[PDB]
Structure formats: C-alpha cells, structure tokens
Design a protein around this ligand. Structure first.
Ligand SMILES: C[C@H]1O[C@H](O[C@H]2[C@H](O)[C@@H](O)[C@@H](O[C@H]3[C@H](O)[C@@H](O)[C@@H](O)O[C@@H]3CO)O[C@@H]2CO)[C@H](O)[C@@H](O)[C@@H]1N[C@H]1C=C(CO)[C@@H](O)[C@H](O)[C@H]1O
Ligand SMILES: C[C@H]1O[C@H](O[C@H]2[C@H](O)[C@@H](O)[C@@H](O[C@H]3[C@H](O)[C@@H](O)[C@@H](O)O[C@@H]3CO)O[C@@H]2CO)[C@H](O)[C@@H](O)[C@@H]1N[C@H]1C=C(CO)[C@@H](O)[C@H](O)[C@H]1O
Ligand SMILES: C[C@H]1O[C@H](O[C@H]2[C@H](O)[C@@H](O)[C@@H](O[C@H]3[C@H](O)[C@@H](O)[C@@H](O)O[C@@H]3CO)O[C@@H]2CO)[C@H](O)[C@@H](O)[C@@H]1N[C@H]1C=C(CO)[C@@H](O)[C@H](O)[C@H]1O
Ligand SMILES: C[C@H]1O[C@H](O[C@H]2[C@H](O)[C@@H](O)[C@@H](O[C@H]3[C@H](O)[C@@H](O)[C@@H](O)O[C@@H]3CO)O[C@@H]2CO)[C@H](O)[C@@H](O)[C@@H]1N[C@H]1C=C(CO)[C@@H](O)[C@H](O)[C@H]1O
Ligand SMILES: C[C@H]1O[C@H](O[C@H]2[C@H](O)[C@@H](O)[C@@H](O[C@H]3[C@H](O)[C@@H](O)[C@@H](O)O[C@@H]3CO)O[C@@H]2CO)[C@H](O)[C@@H](O)[C@@H]1N[C@H]1C=C(CO)[C@@H](O)[C@H](O)[C@H]1O
Ligand SMILES: C[C@H]1O[C@H](O[C@H]2[C@H](O)[C@@H](O)[C@@H](O[C@H]3[C@H](O)[C@@H](O)[C@@H](O)O[C@@H]3CO)O[C@@H]2CO)[C@H](O)[C@@H](O)[C@@H]1N[C@H]1C=C(CO)[C@@H](O)[C@H](O)[C@H]1O
Ligand SMILES: [Ca+2]
Ligand SMILES: [Ca+2]
Ligand SMILES: [Ca+2]
Ligand SMILES: [Ca+2]
Length: 482
C-alpha cells in the first residue's frame, strides 16, 4: 500500500534565471523522502520569450535547445538540464508529468493575410461584422530549429482564429473563413462557444494538425521518458480530441501515461460532462474544491463546514480527481485569482492529504513561498501533513462532517503498515472537541498532535473512540505515539 502525492513544481513569479531544472535535480531526493511520488513540471518548450512561463508556446519541439525567440534556454533551463531533472526524479523513485499546451500558439515568425469575421466576445456563434482581410500572426517556420525532429510548418489554415489584426491594430475575436472552417465542438459553452482563448487558436478539426500533435506526443515521450501529462486548458479544446490523442501516444510509446486535465470551472456538472465525453481517459483537477477552500477561508467562520465536500470531484469521482489548495493561476495578480488565506491553508492541505479520496498535490508557491508578494513559505506546516500521509493515512475512513465549524474524519490504519492510523480535526471557527472512532485495535493507546499545534494528548477508550480536540481556526492531526 502507498499514498500517491504529486507536487506542482513551479509558480508564476519565479525569476527568469534558468535554474528550475537544476533545482528539480537537487531536490528530488528530499521530496521523495517526504512521500512525494510525482512532479508536475511547467511547459518545457520554447515560449514567446525566455521569460514566458510556458503557456505562450512558440515551438513544441524546442526544449531549450535551439536559438529561437532571443534565447537558447527556456525560462527553466536548457534541454540537457531538462533531461537530467527527469532522470534525477526517476532515480529517486518519482514519476514526472509534463505540461502540455495544445489550445493555441503564439509568437509567430510572421503574419499572413486571412479572410476573417468578427464574432461576439460573449457569443462566439454570432458574427458581428462582414468578412474582411486581416493580418494575423500565424506563420511558423522555426528559423532556429530548421527541420530537426519535425519539418511541419504552421499557417493560418491550421488555426480557427486570432484576437489581433496587425494591419489595423484591432483587438477583436476573429474567426477565420474557409471550407469547413468553424469553431471546434464540443467545447465549453460559456460565451456560447469557448474554443477561442488567446494567441492563434488551434483547429483540432484539421487532420494535418491532429497528425502533427500525435507525432509530437510520441516524439516527446520517447525523447524525455516522462511518465505522464498535465493537459492545459482542456475546456477550450475539442473534447473528442484527447481520447484519440492519448490512446495514440500511450500505445505508440508503450507507457500508461497518467493524465490530468485542467477543466477550469466551479460547476461540477461541466466536469462530469467532460469526464463522460472523454470516457474517463484522464483525471481532472478538482477546481470546485479549490473554490470551497477559498470561500471558507474568506467567510469569517460563517461557512458551513458540513458542505466542504459537496459538489466536488473528490466527493463525486474520487479516482479521477486531482486535488489541490492553490496553483499558479489562483495566485495574487493572476486572472483566476482566488488565493486561499494562509490561516486556512494548513486546514485545506490536511483535508486533501489525510483523506482517502483523490490524488493530492502540494503547490510550489505554498511550499517554498512567493517572494514577489512577500508570502512566506509554509513548508514547516506542510511537512507534518506529508508525514501524516506517508505513514499514517491508511485504511478504513470514518467521516464526521457534522458541525458547521468543526469537522473531522479518521483513518484506522492497516496491518501492513504498523503504527498507521490517524484522527484529523479542522475548524473554520472556535475550537472544541469531537468524539470519533479510530478502531478498538487502538484501545489504551495515546495519540499526540502530529502538527504540534496542541500539546495535550488523547487516550483511546476501550471501545475504540477518542475525544479529539482542535484549537480555533486550526488543524490537529492525532496519531499514535510509539
Ligand atoms: C511512483 C509510483 O508510480 C506508479 O504509481 C502511479 C500510478 O501508476 C498512477 O496511475 C497514479 O495513481 C493515481 C491514480 O491514477 C488515481 O486514480 C488516484 O486514485 O490516486 C493514485 C495515486 O494516489 O499516480 C501514481 C504515483 O503517484 C506505480 O504504480 C508505482 O509502482 C510507483 N511507486 C510504488 C512502487 C512500490 C512497490 O513496491 C512502492 O514503493 C509504493 O507502493 C509505491 O510508491
Ligand atoms: C503582436 C503579437 O500579437 C499576438 O499576441 C497577442 C495575443 O494574441 C493576445 O491574445 C494577448 O495575449 C495575452 C493573453 O490573451 C492573456 O491571457 C495573457 O495571459 O497572455 C498574453 C499577454 O499578452 O497579447 C498578445 C501580445 O499582444 C500574436 O499572437 C503575437 O505572436 C504577436 N507577437 C509578434 C510581435 C513581435 C514584435 O515584432 C515579435 O517579437 C513576436 O515574435 C511576434 O510573434
Ligand atoms: C479554398 C481552398 O482552401 C482549402 O484549404 C483549407 C480550407 O479552406 C480550410 O478550411 C481547412 O480545411 C479544414 C477545416 O478547417 C477543418 O474543419 C476540417 O474540415 O479539415 C479541413 C482540412 O482537411 O484547411 C484547408 C487546407 O488544409 C483547400 O486547400 C482547397 O481544397 C480549397 N480550394 C477549393 C476552391 C473552390 C471554392 O469553391 C472549389 O471549387 C475547389 O474544388 C476547391 O479545391
Ligand atoms: C486568461 C484566462 O481566461 C480563461 O479563464 C476564464 C474562465 O474560463 C472563465 O470561466 C472565468 O473564469 C472564472 C472567474 O475568473 C472566477 O471568478 C470564477 O469564480 O468563475 C469563472 C469560472 O467559473 O473568467 C476567465 C476569463 O478571464 C481561461 O480558462 C484561463 O485558463 C486563462 N488563464 C490562463 C490561460 C492559460 C492557457 O494556456 C493558462 O495556462 C495560464 O496559466 C493563464 O494565463
Ligand atoms: C470567536 C473565536 O474564534 C477565533 O478566531 C478564529 C476564527 O473563528 C476563524 O474564523 C479564523 O479567523 C480568521 C478570519 O476568518 C479571517 O477573516 C482573518 O481575519 O484571520 C482570522 C485568523 O487569523 O481563525 C481564528 C483563529 O485564529 C478564535 O478561535 C478565538 O480566539 C475566538 N474567541 C476570541 C475572540 C476575542 C475577543 O472576544 C479574543 O480576544 C479572545 O482570545 C477570544 O475570546
Ligand atoms: C496547568 C494547565 O495545563 C494544561 O494545559 C494544556 C491544555 O490542554 C491546552 O491549553 C493545551 O492546548 C493548547 C496548545 O497546546 C497551545 O499550542 C495553544 O496554542 O492552544 C491550546 C489551548 O487551547 O496545552 C496545555 C498543555 O497540556 C491544562 O489543560 C490546563 O487546564 C491546566 N490549567 C490551566 C488552565 C486555566 C484556565 O482557566 C487556568 O485558570 C489555570 O490556572 C491553569 O493552571
Ligand atoms: Ca475548427
Ligand atoms: Ca481552443
Ligand atoms: Ca479551435
Ligand atoms: Ca463555519
């Protein structure tokens, strides 16, 4: 038995110093000893510039190897350093998930003239202009790479649209004209059709494009030996595309390739729609649960903690849910900003780390800190919870989400891991106590608070129950002493 634990190993405001790949190589041992079993690494290919975080993808085939966009290395380092990081992660017994950005392409080498029409930004099925010629950033020739690995050249007809006309300096949503040219479907229905997002938007209906992304998928897994994918911005990408893409790349590389997609919506039914449409071929980030943590942390104690799990992927589809507290898009200043307050953050990590539903992740920004906004590191509060997950969070779970402030759950432990077992309490309000069942196999044992928030102890009764306790606005994780 084991508890998988992933770590997203970057944040937005990292300096553009080309050191992240080296840091993975240096830290892989430490993180593994804490029970981290997988790293989600940022996009490793060349962006619109060297300080691009990776989501403005210029060349999928340039892993910090070719002189392109004014730099050889990416933000994170060179191609050689990227490979060493992956091998170090493997030597320490960790999987590696690579960020995959297929929705769009930016930083084109040149413009092309294209017949286009404006569509309504709030309803992309509604044309709001006539057809006219625009100058669109869609020519990709890759002067620094040549035909190495791939001789495919991208042009306007491989895309469905852009949001910038270079001749008139106009910013509108332009749909391209052409035989069969249309926004892709199925996609998210916010704004009527949410296929267009930014830069030059890929046409997943074009067979040349499907083929090229399949060839890149195979090439990339074989070049890097990565173990899986984090799929960026999947709600803006033809739903049927990734079932077909993943089954090609998995079977043509001989690898299972665990895959988590980022479907950003707090509407659980949209996530359920996407899982059924893609036949459960991938996990998804539990964005609704993130929204729960953010809301509870801002509600001054008035959140009903009995609803913390309701309408989350961790409640509804736990084996396809990847759980988290914050990520690079929820950071201060970002477009999805909804930063979980530091007082509540240890409570949210305890919830995803010591419970049996879902595949939890630790955020780099939470672990190491975000100096850009003077947010201090929470490593000293997260590490006890990882040790809880590594050693104690095993076996039958009993739920007590039964009070509007104080909620808890227990894990009984497993014979295969002697000394396992835990009882966790969190509260968004004043402290208190709660009786919970850990199992009569623990009768007489003394439990202590692994987080060190409390100095007292709890003795288990002859019937397997303990009256566990928590401070106000705090976490306690009670585990057996030895
Ligand atoms: C390091 C670890 O890699 C493998 O485990 C990974 C799984 O193959 C993935 O599928 C994924 O599992 C998650 C599920 O997809 C998901 O539905 C959810 O329910 O949570 C799961 C994770 O909690 O991620 C896993 C890694 O995080 C591989 O199977 C495993 O063998 C590898 N490590 C084990 C190796 C040994 C066996 O002797 C022991 O050290 C431990 O049991 C494991 O650490
Ligand atoms: C001039 C530039 O225009 C295009 O790039 C723009 C995008 O199309 C816009 O959508 C917008 O992107 C922002 C995102 O929407 C936003 O969500 C944020 O997260 O990231 C972006 C921040 O700006 O803005 C983009 C730039 O204005 C076009 O795709 C792009 O390729 C064009 N860049 C060319 C211009 C120069 C100067 O000659 C060259 O350095 C580039 O290599 C060219 O590619
Ligand atoms: C007009 C001329 O352009 C054609 O080139 C591109 C199409 O215009 C694009 O729309 C695009 O087609 C893809 C769709 O966007 C996509 O939704 C999916 O259906 O796959 C399509 C590609 O398989 O990409 C095309 C190029 O890759 C095309 O090269 C060419 O056949 C077209 N020439 C026609 C001109 C007239 C117009 O009446 C007709 O008389 C001729 O029979 C056509 O040859
Ligand atoms: C730039 C940003 O645009 C998209 O995000 C939009 C959402 O999809 C909309 O539904 C809405 O987002 C949420 C609200 O912000 C939030 O208040 C929430 O309570 O409700 C809405 C969803 O329930 O507004 C957003 C428009 O600004 C897009 O999905 C998101 O991914 C984009 N930000 C990233 C763009 C890339 C894609 O390559 C990411 O990888 C980058 O990290 C970000 O720049
Ligand atoms: C009433 C009782 O609650 C105290 O504070 C906890 C809150 O219940 C939680 O909601 C949370 O407070 C955070 C806010 O939600 C957030 O908006 C932000 O302001 O940060 C707050 C945390 O820093 O966490 C609180 C625990 O730190 C706490 O359990 C307890 O001390 C409170 N009773 C005190 C109230 C006053 C005067 O009546 C204090 O001087 C006394 O120590 C207690 O009587
Ligand atoms: C003599 C004194 O010791 C005991 O105090 C323990 C209490 O169980 C808690 O205070 C316990 O948890 C605290 C955390 O360790 C600490 O980190 C803090 O941040 O919050 C928790 C408090 O909620 O730590 C103590 C160590 O065992 C005992 O229970 C306490 O009753 C004992 N008597 C004192 C209590 C009062 C209050 O009216 C005074 O009048 C007495 O004179 C004290 O002697
Ligand atoms: Ca299309
Ligand atoms: Ca799209
Ligand atoms: Ca499209
Ligand atoms: Ca409450």
């Amino acid at each position: 038995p084991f508890n998988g634990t992933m770590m997203q190993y970057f944040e937005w405001y990292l300096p553009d110093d080309g050191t992240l790949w080296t840091k993975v190589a240096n830290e892989a041992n430490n993180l593994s000893s804490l029970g981290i079993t997988a790293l989600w690494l940022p996009p490793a290919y060349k962006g619109t510039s060297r300080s691009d975080v990776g989501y403005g993808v210029y060349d999928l085939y340039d892993l910090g190897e070719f002189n392109q966009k004014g730099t050889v290395r990416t933000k994170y380092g060179t191609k050689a350093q990227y490979l060493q990081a992956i091998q170090a992660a493997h030597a320490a017994g960790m999987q590696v998930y690579a960020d995959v950005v297929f929705d769009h392409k930016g930083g084109a080498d040149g413009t092309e003239w294209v017949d286009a029409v404006e569509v309504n930004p709030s309803d992309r099925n509604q044309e709001i202009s006539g057809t006219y010629q625009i100058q669109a950033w869609t020519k990709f020739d890759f002067p620094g790479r040549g035909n190495t690995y791939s001789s495919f050249k991208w042009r306007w007809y491989h895309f469905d649209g852009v949001d910038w006309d270079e001749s008139r300096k106009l910013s509108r949503i332009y749909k391209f004209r052409g035989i069969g040219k249309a926004w892709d479907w199925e996609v998210d229905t916010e704004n009527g059709n949410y296929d267009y997002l930014m830069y030059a938007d890929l046409d997943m209906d074009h067979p040349e494009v499907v083929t090229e992304l399949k060839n890149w998928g195979k090439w990339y897994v074989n070049t890097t030996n990565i173990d899986g994918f984090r799929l960026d911005a999947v709600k803006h990408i033809k739903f049927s595309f990734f079932p077909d893409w993943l089954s090609y790349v998995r079977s043509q590389t001989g690898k299972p390739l665990f895959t988590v997609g980022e479907y950003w919506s707090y509407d659980i039914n949209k996530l359920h729609n996407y899982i059924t449409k893609t036949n459960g071929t991938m996990s998804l980030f539990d964005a609704p649960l993130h929204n729960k943590f953010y809301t509870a942390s801002k509600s001054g104690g008035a959140f009903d903690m009995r609803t913390l799990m309701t309408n989350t992927l961790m409640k509804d589809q736990p084996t396809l849910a990847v759980t988290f507290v914050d990520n690079h898009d929820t950071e201060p200043g970002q477009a999805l900003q909804s930063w979980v307050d530091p007082w509540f953050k240890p409570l949210a990590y305890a919830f995803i780390l010591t419970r049996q539903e879902g595949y939890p992740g630790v955020f780099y920004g939470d672990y190491y800190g975000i100096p850009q906004y003077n947010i201090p590191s929470l490593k000293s509060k997260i590490d006890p919870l990882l040790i809880a997950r590594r050693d104690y969070a095993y076996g039958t779970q009993h739920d007590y989400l039964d009070h509007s402030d104080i909620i808890g759950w227990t894990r009984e432990g497993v014979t295969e891991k002697p000394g396992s077992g835990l009882a966790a309490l969190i509260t968004d309000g004043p402290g208190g106590s709660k009786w919970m069942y850990v199992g009569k196999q623990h009768a007489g044992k003394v439990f202590y608070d692994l987080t060190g928030n409390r100095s007292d102890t709890v003795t288990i009764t002859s019937d397997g129950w303990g009256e566990f306790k928590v401070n106000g606005g705090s976490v306690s994780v009670w585990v057996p002493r030895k």
